[PDB]
């Protein structure tokens, strides 16, 4: 039951919509970008947000995202 | 050469007990026949010459880990204290029989008393331990 939460979904779309230019398909690239632009208190929440950002990047590379 | 750690300790204590039976000067009393070993044990030991096995075990324990008194000897002689319907516990061994083993091994010229208690093993007895280790090695080979 690894469901990405609403605190991840409200943050990640705003992060991609603002810094859409400085992104990448790799996990270790945007994991350090989110450390710069955002203030995440914990490593587990940071990794969940970064994984959902990479999943949204895979959705972008597949097609258009409605949200 | 060989050493007593390379020698298996199952037959080493029997060979040293045979050597102490060949010696036969280790102060065996007559209450050994009627004594029980400890209160957690039930009956008397089966073999009649069970002083020499304890003497061989005390000799090898003082060779390997010197500086031991009464408690380190009562720790190895222990088992299940089956009281009956109550749940069993652990009980220590007797003190006087180990004290008589220490007195017999002190009367025999193979040990020497150490400061703050304990009976260390003399360099004369280290030669004897190496020679009986060579004897057990020649017996097994």
């Amino acid at each position: 039951g690894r469901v990405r939460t609403k605190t991840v979904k409200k943050a990640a779309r705003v992060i991609i919509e603002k810094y859409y230019t400085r992104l990448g398909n790799d996990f270790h690239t945007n994991k350090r970008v989110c450390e710069e632009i955002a203030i995440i208190p914990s490593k587990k929440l940071r990794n969940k947000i970064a994984g959902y950002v990479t999943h949204l990047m895979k959705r972008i590379q597949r097609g258009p995202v409605r949200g | 050469g060989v050493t007593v750690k390379d020698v298996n300790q199952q037959e080493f204590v029997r060979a040293l007990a045979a050597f102490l039976k060949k010696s036969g000067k280790l102060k065996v009393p007559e209450w050994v026949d009627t004594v029980k070993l400890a209160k957690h044990k039930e009956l008397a030991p089966y073999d009649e010459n069970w002083f020499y096995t304890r003497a061989a075990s005390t000799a090898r324990h003082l060779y390997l880990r010197g500086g031991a008194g009464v408690g380190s000897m009562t720790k190895i002689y222990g088992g299940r204290q089956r009281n009956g319907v109550m749940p069993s516990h652990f009980s220590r061994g007797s003190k006087s029989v180990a004290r008589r083993v220490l007195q017999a091994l002190e009367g025999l010229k193979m040990v020497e008393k150490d400061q703050d208690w304990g009976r260390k093993l003399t360099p004369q007895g280290q030669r004897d331990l190496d020679r009986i280790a060579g004897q057990v090695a020649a017996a097994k080979k």
Binding site: - | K5, D6, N8
Partner: protein
């Protein structure tokens, strides 16, 4: 030659061991004794499983000193079995070339993982209100 000192720990459980490697003749010892007086004699071949697969050629130059503390008995057997294996892998890794180390490692990967990688299996703590961790007491009705 120089003292090729390789100290590798082996940890699977509470029983731990430290294997120390060296150059020279081949004499494997665990605190100054070989693997021939092990009680019980049922697990005599268990420590010879890494010995018989590699052969007598690989253990000619390798002599290992092992110190053991804690745990039980079979836990100590698995501890020294993991420790001398990881120390032998480190010995063939650091000094001699990597091709022979890979040729030895390809045997150890296919057989068992316990020789190389330990598993996080420890004792779970007892919970309150039961005889053990999972089991509870009998409920008193009426």
């Amino acid at each position: 030659g120089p003292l090729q000192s390789v100290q590798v720990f082996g940890r699977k459980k509470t029983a731990t061991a430290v294997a120390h490697c060296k150059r020279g003749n081949g004499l494997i010892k665990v605190n100054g004794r070989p693997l021939e007086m092990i009680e019980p004699r049922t697990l005599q071949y268990k420590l010879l499983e890494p010995v018989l697969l590699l052969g007598k050629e690989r253990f000619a130059g390798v002599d290992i000193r092992v110190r053991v503390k804690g745990g039980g008995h079979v836990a100590q057997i698995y501890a020294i079995r993991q420790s001398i294996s990881k120390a032998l892998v480190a010995y063939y890794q650091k000094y001699v070339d990597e091709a022979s180390k890979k040729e030895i490692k390809d045997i150890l990967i296919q057989y068992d993982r316990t020789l190389l990688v330990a598993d996080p299996r420890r004792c779970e703590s007892k919970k309150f209100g039961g005889p053990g961790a999972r089991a509870r007491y009998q409920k008193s009705y009426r």
